[PDB]
Design brief:
homodimer; 77 residues; mainly alpha; Non-ribosomal Peptide Synthetase Peptidyl Carrier Protein, Chain A; 60% helix; viral protein; alpha-helical bundle; capsid protein
């Protein structure tokens, strides 16, 4: 579907809108099922807006899933 | 190591230099071993220069590995 490795949070885009685009692309992609979650986590870390990248870095290592990181970011706005 | 999902072939960069940067980053990353090759293949498809993206699309489905695609691109220059 969407070129998942090109997806980055735009300057007018909310984190959740970016996460939804990214995840739709990853789920529609040719990646092995077990690669999806790590790819999503890394693209959140690397491809969100710079301030959000910084916020994600504060989350403890106990937050391991995309859903945990989405709740983390949104609830700190 | 390098943020593997940010890596894209620059306008003055050869395909092999980009492939080497990308692969170094992927190999140094937190991705599961089995995710590496598909991630590399997709980042070649999506993150090379536009003309190279087009060339990669011509390669038949029988070319499945990063090394096969690297030889394919380089030998057609």
């Amino acid at each position: 579907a969407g070129p998942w490795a090109d997806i980055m949070q735009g300057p007018s885009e909310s984190f959740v809108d970016f996460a939804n685009r990214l995840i739709k692309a990853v789920e529609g992609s040719n990646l092995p099922p077990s690669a999806r979650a790590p790819v999503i986590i890394d693209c959140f870390r690397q491809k969100s807006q710079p301030d959000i990248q910084q916020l994600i870095r504060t989350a403890p290592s106990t937050l391991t899933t995309p859903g945990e990181i989405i709740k983390y970011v949104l609830d700190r706005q």
